[PDB]
Amino acid sequence: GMWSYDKITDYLMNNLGEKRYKHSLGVMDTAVRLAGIYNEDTEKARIAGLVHDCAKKLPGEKIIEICTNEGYELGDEDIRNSYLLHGLAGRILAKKVIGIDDEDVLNAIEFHTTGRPNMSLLEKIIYIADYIEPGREFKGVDELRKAADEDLNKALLMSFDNTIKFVIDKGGFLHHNTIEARNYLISRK
Amino acid sequence: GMWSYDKITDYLMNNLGEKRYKHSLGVMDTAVRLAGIYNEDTEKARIAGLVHDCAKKLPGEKIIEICTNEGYELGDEDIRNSYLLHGLAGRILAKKVIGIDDEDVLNAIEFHTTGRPNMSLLEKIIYIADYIEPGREFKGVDELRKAADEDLNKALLMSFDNTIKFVIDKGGFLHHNTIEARNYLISRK
Ligand SMILES: [Fe+3]
Ligand SMILES: [Fe+3]
Ligand SMILES: [Fe+3]
Ligand SMILES: [Fe+3]
Numbered sequence A, B: 001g002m003w004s005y006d007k008i009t010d011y012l013m014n015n016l017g018e019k020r021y022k023h024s025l026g027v028m029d030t031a032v033r034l035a036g037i038y039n040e041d042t043e044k045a046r047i048a049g050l051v052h053d054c055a056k057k058l059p060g061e062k063i064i065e066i067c068t069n070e071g072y073e074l075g076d077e078d079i080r081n082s083y084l085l086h087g088l089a090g091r092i093l094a095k096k097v098i099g100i101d102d103e104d105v106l107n108a109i110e111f112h113t114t115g116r117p118n119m120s121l122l123e124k125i126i127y128i129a130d131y132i133e134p135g136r137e138f139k140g141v142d143e144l145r146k147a148a149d150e151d152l153n154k155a156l157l158m159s160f161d162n163t164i165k166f167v168i169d170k171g172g173f174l175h176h177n178t179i180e181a182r183n184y185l186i187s188r189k
Helices: A005-038 A042-051 A060-069 A087-098 A103-110 A121-132 A141-150 A152-170 A176-188 B005-038 B042-051 B060-069 B087-098 B103-110 B121-132 B141-150 B152-170 B176-188
Strands: none
Touching (some): A005 A141, A042 A087, A060 A087, A087 A103, A121 A152, B005 B121, B005 B141, B042 B087, B042 B103, B042 B121, B060 B087, B087 B103, B103 B121, B121 B141, B141 B152
């Protein structure tokens, strides 16, 4: 069955450490706030936000092993940036360890690192909450916060654009889910 | 059989018009020059460069119809930027109308608009020649020309980066082949 809130918080503090656990509470609170604005279920928002980073502190090799063992097919393109995953590994832990069965919550956890095409409202909220939670501080966090409060799709687009430019600037790999997520928003806009 | 050079030039002038035909001769000459630098076959370079834009002046709807009729499966992601495709339609015309059978030449024509992972030397030469042919003039064309003369992979990477940033800036769609082409170069670098 599903773990109690208190059992979950114990598990997250143990696995994530103080700083990342505090981040997670911030994401939770932010997800709940956005849920209020957009009429999303508050408890779906609270649980997905709370547990979204449950696999964050695992080594990439272990993340890959968890995903592979549970039946997910990963390609070389998924393995080469193993950081990214922690969303899928987190979905797996949320389902198999924590006992969370809600499909929307599991998707929101899975795709929070990259986004994807045709995201649910909950998926969007969890994705953006990670960027705008109160504990975050970076150039432009404010416009992003404003946009999230008014026009969620705009906020995601702004985030995707920033990510892609940053990766280009750093010479890193670009994940297809992020590219496809952005295209999908442009085509609906 | 394959058309004579003179028949090809007649066809290109008629179909492309003066300005775009002149561009094509520039690409041809540039491809030949780069072929000399990199030890690629000069006649493969000359024909691919000459005919690469043979389908450029067709309407997008007709480009799509040519590709579909000849058996290529196009997705919504291919159709939404139909401009791009003219490479595949050009490959089809080069094979079925002009009588060009060389697989490498056909690939170089097909992928000149986007690039792709694991390009041949000829594919790379045709792709970059389009950007650096003498008739071109834009911010940074010079560094691109320098890089092409010394480090072809560097030049492509620079081009892909520029394209992606430009599309983001303009709010357009990003084609998976360009993203995948860039990732492939980063992973070999
Ligand atoms: Fe995360
Ligand atoms: Fe996070
Ligand atoms: Fe072209
Ligand atoms: Fe061209």
